[PDB]
Structure 1
Amino acid sequence: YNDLRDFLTLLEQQGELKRITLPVDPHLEITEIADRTLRAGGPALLFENPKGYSMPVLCNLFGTPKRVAMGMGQEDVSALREVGKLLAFLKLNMPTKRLRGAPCQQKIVSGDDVDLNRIPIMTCWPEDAAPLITWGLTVTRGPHKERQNLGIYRQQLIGKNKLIMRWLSHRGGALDYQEWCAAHPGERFPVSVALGADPATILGAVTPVPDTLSEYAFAGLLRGTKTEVVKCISNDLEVPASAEIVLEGYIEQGETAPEGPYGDHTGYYNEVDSFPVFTVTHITQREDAIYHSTYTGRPPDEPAVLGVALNEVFVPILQKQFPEIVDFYLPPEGCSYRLAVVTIKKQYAGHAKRVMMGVWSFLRQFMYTKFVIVCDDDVNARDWNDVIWAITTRMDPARDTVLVENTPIDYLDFASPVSGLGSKMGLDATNKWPGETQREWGRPIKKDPDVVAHIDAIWDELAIF
């Protein structure tokens, strides 16, 4: 049973983890280093000497697709499709295995001794409001079901023992709190946050499994074995046994604070807004604890790399429903969800429009996708050279562009004319069939597969690079 430390050791053995011994400030400096590293496809980073703290800081953990795959016990990135086929069936789901004691409760501090300032929480960007916890697995139960939800919600530092809990309103945690409030007026909402759990639990948390299902159960499937957990000290929630740090506490009903501004995955600052305050009553950690952090900003960043790997998970679920779809890609440059390229084997006139509507309606994660480009299967959706080629040789813009007004949009997307409402554009860049055009359509250049394969065979020997 591999905890996070075992994963770091595996990475180090493979030249995928660098230990930095120079002094580096968690205030801005770590982010700059991680950003350059991620942008060059470099390793994960363990800062052994954060200025002013004793606890090392781990970041860029999932900065490459490879390391995301490795984190689910797979060799490489195309095994994620198989995990998609699995995620299909969940639309006896294995419980947690509760241990009696756990490394994450080796050192405990509570009440007045709680001081989040001892932790090397990072400040990512110059106009961010305060240090920000970015890799916390927040654990919650609602009043109506037993399911334990895990989500990653950014958490601003506002005191020795107070964090702001920034869950957006459709999240498991947020819905649990909302229901708790209705069902138990004025009663404190217990919550716990785990930092540095095992990679399967972390990845399970971020995968959009249905609200009905504990993210712990999914992590179990990725791992091959039940998720090892421990009961929290001050509530009935369970956290991963191997976690490096655990924060336990509650939300006082009605207590809120102005959150931000903070730089986002879109590359802009979010403006101030109100979210609940999480009061921390306990902090439990391992001996020699490691603090796991990250940053979001202009893409690409670690979340976006995560999000490309998790798109591979969705391809099979889309293909079950639309078997005409050969590939489906959300470029990290499009802020991970705002633009999709879809390639199909077109079977009839107007086919592309059915596929656009399918992307905009079938799965909720794509409901806010503003641009959808549809192409034939002779295009590689992951290469702008092919996609722009297809756009500029197979479209008449007015004929082949679909615009739909007054559709749901992310309320933080400031480019829509009104908060929560905007338009969508689909580009039909498929070959046009009789009926769709009265011209003689061009015959595209296809490569000889025998020549392709032969050159694959001698590629390394040719040694051009």
Structure 2
Amino acid sequence: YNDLRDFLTLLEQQGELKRITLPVDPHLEITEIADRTLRAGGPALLFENPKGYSMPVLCNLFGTPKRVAMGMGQEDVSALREVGKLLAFLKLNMPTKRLRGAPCQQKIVSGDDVDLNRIPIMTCWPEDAAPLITWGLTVTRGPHKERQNLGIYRQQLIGKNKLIMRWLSHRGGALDYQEWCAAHPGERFPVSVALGADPATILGAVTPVPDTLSEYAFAGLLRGTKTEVVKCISNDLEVPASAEIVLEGYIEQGETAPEGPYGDHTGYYNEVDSFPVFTVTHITQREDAIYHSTYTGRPPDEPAVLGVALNEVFVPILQKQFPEIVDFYLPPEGCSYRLAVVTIKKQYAGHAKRVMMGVWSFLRQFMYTKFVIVCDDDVNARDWNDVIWAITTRMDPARDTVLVENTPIDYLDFASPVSGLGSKMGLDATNKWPGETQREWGRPIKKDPDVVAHIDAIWDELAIF
């Protein structure tokens, strides 16, 4: 049973983990180092000597797509499509195996002894309001079913034992809380947060499984074995037995705090807003605990890289519905969800428009995607040289652009005319068939596949780089 430490050893053996012994400040400096590292596609980083703390800080864990694949037990990034077919089928799944004891409860501190200032919580960007917890798996139950939701919600430090719980309203945690308030007026909402669980559990948290299903069950499928958990000390929620640190407590109904500003995955600061306060009554941890953290900012960042790997999971699901789709890609540069490029085997005049409408309606992850570019299958969706070529040689802008107004848009997207509402643009860059054009369309240059294959074979021997 691989916990997180086993994963770090695996990475270190493969030159995918680097230990920093120099003094480095959790205030701003770690983010700067990790940002350079990620942008050059370097290793995961373990800062063994954070200025002013004894607990090492692990970050950039999932800063390459390879390391996301490795964290699901697979060799490479193409294996992620198979986990996508699996995800199709859930739309008996395996419960958790509850241990009687666990390393994450070796050292326990509670009540007045709780001090989150002892943890090397990072400050990411210069005008961020305060230190911010960024890799917490938040565990909740609602009042109406047994299912335990795991989510990643950022958490601002506001006291020795107070965090802000910044879940957006469509998240599992926020729905569970909202229902608890209606169904049990005035009663404290139990909550627990696990830091540094095994990678299958972490990636399971972030994969959008149904709300009906526990993210613990999915992680079991990725792992091949049941997720090992332990009952929390102060509530009936279960947390991963291998966790490095666990926070337990509750949300007092009505209690809220102004959150942020914080730099966001779009590369801008979110302005201040109110969210629930999470009161921390217990902090449990391993001997030798490692603090797992990250940051978001201008893309690409670790979330963006996670998001590119998880898009591979969705390709199969889309292809099941739309078998004409050859590839489907959401570039990191587009803030991970705002632009999609789709390639198809076009079969009839107008086909591109059906595909756009499918991207905008089929799955909710893409409901808010404001640019969609559709191309033929001779275009590599992942290369702007091909995509721009297609746009500039197969479109007449006014004929081939679809605009739709008053559509749902992310409420934090300041570029839309009104919060929550905006337009979308679809670019039909497919070759135009009779009916779509009265001109003689051009015959595109295709490569000889035998020449390509021969050059693949002798490429290393050629030794050009």
Q: Which residue of 1 aligns with 2:335?
A: 335
C-alpha offsets along residues 417-447 of structure 1, whole Å, 9 cap, x if unaligned? 0000000000000000000000000000000
d(CA) in 2 for partners of 1:462 and 1:55? 49
Q: Secondary structure at the match of 1:309?
A: helix
Q: Which residue of 1 aligns with 2:376?
A: 376
d(CA) in 2 for partners of 1:145 and 1:394? 52
Displacement after TM superposition at 1:12 (Å) = 0.2
d(CA) in 2 for partners of 1:419 and 1:283? 38
C-alpha offsets along residues 146-204 of structure 1, whole Å, 9 cap, x if unaligned? 00000000000000000000000000000000000000000000000000000000000
What pairs with 1:33-432 in structure 2 (closer than 5 Å)?
33-432=33-432
d(CA) in 1 for partners of 2:169 and 2:267? 22
C-alpha offsets along residues 285-305 of structure 1, whole Å, 9 cap, x if unaligned? 000000000000000000000
Q: Secondary structure at the match of 1:203?
A: helix
Displacement after TM superposition at 1:98 (Å) = 0.2
Displacement after TM superposition at 1:346 (Å) = 0.1
d(CA) in 2 for partners of 1:46 and 1:109? 25
Q: Secondary structure at the match of 1:239?
A: strand
d(CA) in 2 for partners of 1:403 and 1:430? 17
Q: Secondary structure at the match of 1:359?
A: helix
Displacement after TM superposition at 1:390 (Å) = 0.1
d(CA) in 1 for partners of 2:76 and 2:163? 37
Cα root mean square deviation, aligned:
0.2
Q: Secondary structure at the match of 1:185?
A: coil
Q: Secondary structure at the match of 2:443?
A: coil
Displacement after TM superposition at 1:368 (Å) = 0.1
d(CA) in 2 for partners of 1:207 and 1:269? 25
d(CA) in 2 for partners of 1:97 and 1:127? 43
TM-score (norm 1): 1.00
d(CA) in 2 for partners of 1:415 and 1:99? 50
Displacement after TM superposition at 1:66 (Å) = 0.4
C-alpha offsets along residues 199-253 of structure 1, whole Å, 9 cap, x if unaligned? 0000000000010000000000000010000000000000000000000000000
C-alpha offsets along residues 348-380 of structure 1, whole Å, 9 cap, x if unaligned? 000000000000000000000000000000000
Displacement after TM superposition at 1:282 (Å) = 0.1
Displacement after TM superposition at 1:409 (Å) = 0.2
d(CA) in 2 for partners of 1:434 and 1:70? 48
Displacement after TM superposition at 1:111 (Å) = 0.1
TM-score (norm 2): 1.00
Displacement after TM superposition at 1:341 (Å) = 0.1
Q: Secondary structure at the match of 2:128?
A: coil
d(CA) in 2 for partners of 1:96 and 1:189? 22
Displacement after TM superposition at 1:412 (Å) = 0.1
Displacement after TM superposition at 1:132 (Å) = 0.1
Q: Secondary structure at the match of 2:444?
A: coil
Structure 2 gaps, min length 5: none
Return structure 1 stretches of 4+ with deviation > 6 angstroms. Answer: none
Displacement after TM superposition at 1:321 (Å) = 0.1
Displacement after TM superposition at 1:20 (Å) = 0.1
d(CA) in 2 for partners of 1:186 and 1:157? 24
d(CA) in 2 for partners of 1:266 and 1:97? 39
- State the percentage of identical aligned residues: 100
C-alpha offsets along residues 83-111 of structure 1, whole Å, 9 cap, x if unaligned? 00000011101000000000000000000
d(CA) in 1 for partners of 2:87 and 2:332? 23
Displacement after TM superposition at 1:8 (Å) = 0.2
d(CA) in 2 for partners of 1:433 and 1:131? 56
d(CA) in 1 for partners of 2:117 and 2:262? 19
d(CA) in 2 for partners of 1:362 and 1:112? 50
Q: Secondary structure at the match of 1:117?
A: helix
d(CA) in 2 for partners of 1:351 and 1:391? 16
Q: Secondary structure at the match of 2:404?
A: strand
d(CA) in 2 for partners of 1:250 and 1:394? 57
d(CA) in 2 for partners of 1:286 and 1:165? 24
d(CA) in 1 for partners of 2:136 and 2:447? 49
